[PDB]
Each structure stands twice: as structure tokens, then as C-alpha cells.
Amino acid sequence: MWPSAKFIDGRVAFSRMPAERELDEVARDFDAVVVLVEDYELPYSLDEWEKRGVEVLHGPIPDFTAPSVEQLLEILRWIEERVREGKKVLIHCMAGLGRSGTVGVAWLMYSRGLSLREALMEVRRKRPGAVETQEQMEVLKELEERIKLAAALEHH
Ligand SMILES: [Cl-]
């Protein structure tokens, strides 16, 4: 297991950007990768993943910014489809902090129904620093309220 990978359940991890020399290892350990960096941040083409038999969702998010709630939910749905096929999924930004941490917190709230508080404490335990900006934090409250609101519809 790639030591940079920070697992938030048995199948999904977040990390920093693998370097090109790290790709063979990351590919032996993961079947799918959600790449959250922008093109100019990458030091190799995303074909390198394809060549190694790894499925890619490229969901670029400019650094120190936040996805919208709809980008987040799109990423979550794709992660869920792969987990269902028996895959392991790595989510990665550049530093392993704000962007990939924001998605990882979103993954715990969606898949396990934990509060933003409990999810954020789990992600920070694995990587202190994660979720960097207040826009990142805001989108997570936005998502939390939507999750509560959707769970409330199902009760009544
Ligand atoms: Cl919704």
C-alpha cells in the first residue's frame, strides 16, 4: 500500500499528487483515481493512468478554491459506482490537503451519514491541515444540509 494514501474507509483513500515514478505502485493498489488538479499542475499526461489500467475521473478544481455542491455530488456518484464494482478509489489534489480533503469529507458524509463534525475530525486525524479555506468549509455545510434535507424527505 502506497504510504501516502490516507484511507477514509476500506476502499477510498485521499492523497497528495503521485509523482510519475509513483504511478506503477499507485496502479497496483488502486483501480480508479479522481484527479482534482488542473492540467497545468500535472507533470505527466493522464494517459499514464490508462496505460496502467486505472480508470480516471478528471474533475479539475483550481487550487485553494471549492467545488460547487453539484461538482461534489457528481464526484461522489462516480466514486460510489466504482466502489460497487469492487474497486478501490484514490482521490488526489496537489498537496493532499484542501481539495482532496474536501472530497474525502464529502465521501464520509454521503456514504456513512456522519455529521460534518465527525467526518472532518476523521479526515484531520489522517491528515491534519485538510480542508484549507472557508469556501471549502462552506460547500461542506451546503452538502451536509442537503444530505439532512434528503434524509428528512425519506422519513416523512
Ligand atoms: Cl439535493
Author numbering: 1 to 156
Can you list sentences taken from the study reporting this PDB entry?
In this study, we report the crystal structures of three forms of Tk-PTP, which showed that this protein forms a canonical DUSP fold and that it undergoes an atypical temperature-dependent conformational change between two forms. Structural and biochemical analyses revealed that this structural alteration requires the presence of the GG motif in the P-loop, and that Tk-PTP has dual amino acids, Asp63 and Glu132, both functioning as the general acid/base residues. PTP proteins commonly share a highly conserved active site motif called the PTP signature motif, which is also present in Tk-PTP as HC93MGGLGR99. This motif, constituting the phosphate binding loop (or simply called P-loop), contains the catalytic cysteine residue (Cys93) that functions as a nucleophile for dephosphorylation and the conserved arginine residue (Arg99) that anchors the phosphate group of the substrate during the enzyme reaction.
To confirm whether the unusual structural conversion of Tk-PTP is indeed associated with the presence of a flexible GG motif within its P-loop, we prepared a recombinant Tk-PTP protein containing the Gly95Ala mutation, referred to as Tk-PTP(G95A). The GG motif within the Tk-PTP P-loop was abolished by this mutation; therefore, it was expected that Tk-PTP(G95A) would have a canonically arranged P-loop, similar to that of Tk-PTP(form II). Tk-PTP(G95A) was expressed and purified as was Tk-PTP(form I), and then subjected to crystallization trials without being heated. The structure of Tk-PTP(G95A) was determined up to a resolution of 2.3 Å using cubic-shaped crystals with the space group H3. Intriguingly, the resulting crystal structure of Tk-PTP(G95A) was nearly identical to that of Tk-PTP(form II), especially in terms of the conformation of both P-loop and α4−α5 loop. The P-loop of Tk-PTP(G95A) matched very well with that of Tk-PTP(form II) with RMSDs of 0.16 Å over eight Cα atoms and 0.25 Å over the entire 55 atoms. Accordingly, the ϕ and ψ dihedral angles of the 4th (Ala95) and 5th (Gly96) residues of the Tk-PTP(G95A) P-loop are similar to those of Tk-PTP(form II), but quite different from those of Tk-PTP(form I). Taken together, the α4−α5 loop of Tk-PTP(G95A) is structurally similar to the corresponding loop of Tk-PTP(form II). Collectively, this structural analysis indicates that Tk-PTP(G95A) adopts an enzymatically active structure even without heat treatment, and that the presence of the unusual GG motif in the P-loop enables the described structural flexibility of wild-type Tk-PTP, the characterizing feature of this protein differentiating it from other PTP proteins. The catalytic activities of Tk-PTP(G95A), which constitutively adopts a catalytically active form, was also measured by the same method.
